[PDB]
C-alpha cells in the first residue's frame, strides 16, 4: 500500500518531496518552522493515494490548533489541498492521516529556519524524503 505525498513551504520556497512512508495506508510529516516576525506561510500538499477503498483525509495542526486544508485541485492520480497561515512566533505545523501513534511516530520531521537559511530533516521517518529549495520548475501547479 504505497501513498505519495509531495509538501510545498512555497512562500519560503521549500519543496518537502516524499514526506509519503515507504508502506502503509497512512501519510503524513511534521515542520518546524523558526520565525522572529509576523510572516505569512502557504502550505501545497499533492496527494496521490494507492488506488484502495478509503482515501483517509490529511488534517494539519499549527501549534496544535486545527486548520481547514482548501482542496484546491481533483483529478483520477492526485488531490491537492492548500493553506495560508499567519505565524508570527517559533512555530510547528503537523500534518497527518491517522493520530494513533503506530503510524505518527512513522513521520518525517522537517527544520525550516526562516531565520538564518536553512532546512533540514531531524528524522526521515519510515520515508525516503527529501528538499529541493528553490521549489522545482516541473512542481508549478494551484494559481486562483
Keep these: 500500500v504505497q501513498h505519495k505525498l509531495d509538501i510545498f513551504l512555497v512562500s519560503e520556497g521549500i519543496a518537502i518531496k516524499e514526506a ?16 522572529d516576525k509576523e510572516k505569512t506561510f502557504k502550505f501545497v ?6 488506488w484502495i477503498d478509503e482515501i483517509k483525509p490529511i488534517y494539519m495542526k499549527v501549534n496544535d490548533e486545527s486548520v481547514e486544508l482548501e482542496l484546491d485541485y481533483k483529478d ?3 488531490r491537492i489541498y492548500s ?11 503537523n500534518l497527518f492521516s491517522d493520530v494513533d501513534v503506530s503510524y505518527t511516530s512513522e513521520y518525517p520531521t522537517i527544520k525550516v529556519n526562516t531565520i538564518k537559511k536553512y532546512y533540514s530533516v531531524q528524522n526521515r521517518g519510515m520515508t525516503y ?6 521549489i522545482n520548475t516541473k512542481d508549478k501547479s494551484w494559481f486562483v
Design 20 to 35: 509519503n512512508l515507504l508502506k502503509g495506508d497512512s501519510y503524513g510529516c511534521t515542520i518546524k518552522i523558526k520565525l
Design 76 to 78: 483520477a492520480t492526485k
Design 129 to 134: 524524503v527529501h528538499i529541493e529549495s528553490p
Design 45 to 50: 500538499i499533492v496527494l496521490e493515494p494507492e
Design 83 to 93: 493553506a495560508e497561515v499567519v505565524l508570527s512566533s517559533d512555530s510547528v505545523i
